[PDB]
Amino acid sequence: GASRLYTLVLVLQPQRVLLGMKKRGFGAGRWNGFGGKVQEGETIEDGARRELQEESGLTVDALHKVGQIVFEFVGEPELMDVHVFCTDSIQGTPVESDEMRPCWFQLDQIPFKDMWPDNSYWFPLLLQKKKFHGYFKFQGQDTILDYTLREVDTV
Numbered sequence: 001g002a003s004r005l006y007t008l009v010l011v012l013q014p015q016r017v018l019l020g021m022k023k024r025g026f027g028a029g030r031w032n033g034f035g036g037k038v039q040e041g042e043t044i045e046d047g048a049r050r051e052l053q054e055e056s057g058l059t060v061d062a063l064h065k066v067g068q069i070v071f072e073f074v075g076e077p078e079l080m081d082v083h084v085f086c087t088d089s090i091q092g093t094p095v096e097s098d099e100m101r102p103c104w105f106q107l108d109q110i111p112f113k114d115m116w117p118d119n120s121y122w123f124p125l126l127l128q129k130k131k132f133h134g135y136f137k138f139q140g141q142d143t144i145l146d147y148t149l150r151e152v153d154t155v
Ligand SMILES: Nc1nccc(-c2ccccc2)n1
Pocket: 006, 007, 008, 032, 034, 035, 036, 037, 071, 080, 082, 116, 118, 119
C-alpha cells in the first residue's frame, strides 16, 4: 500500500482534446484530464469511466489504456499511481459544475503553461498514440525535481 490508485482520462478526437479546469481542491487553477481515486470494489477502468462522467458529464464507450504515471510529492507519504486512458468515443456534451469547467482545445492550442508541468512531457506521446510509463517527483505542485518517462508496448 505504498501507492494509491487513480485514473486520468483524456478525450482525444482527431482535431481537439477535452480538458478540465479544476475549480477547487487538488490541482485547482490548472487544466488536466479528468480523474480521481479508484474506489473499493471498482476496476481501474470502471473508475476511469465514473470519473469522466462525474467531472465532465460525458459517457464513455471504449476506453483505451495509454499510460501509467507514478507521482511522488515530497513530504507526502502516499504515491499516486495514475492509470491514464484515452477515448475518442463519447456521448453527451461537456458539463460545467461547481468542481470542474471542461473546454475543448485545438491540438495546436493546448494550454501547457496552465497545466500540471508533467503534462508537457507525456502529452506529446499521447497525441502520437504512444503508450508510456512515467514517474515524477514533485516539490509542491509547480516544481518537478526528477522524472523518468519511457515509451512501452504494453501499459
Ligand atoms: N497531470 C497530473 N499531474 C499530477 C497529478 C495528476 C493527477 C491526476 C489524477 C488524479 C490525481 C493526480 N495529474
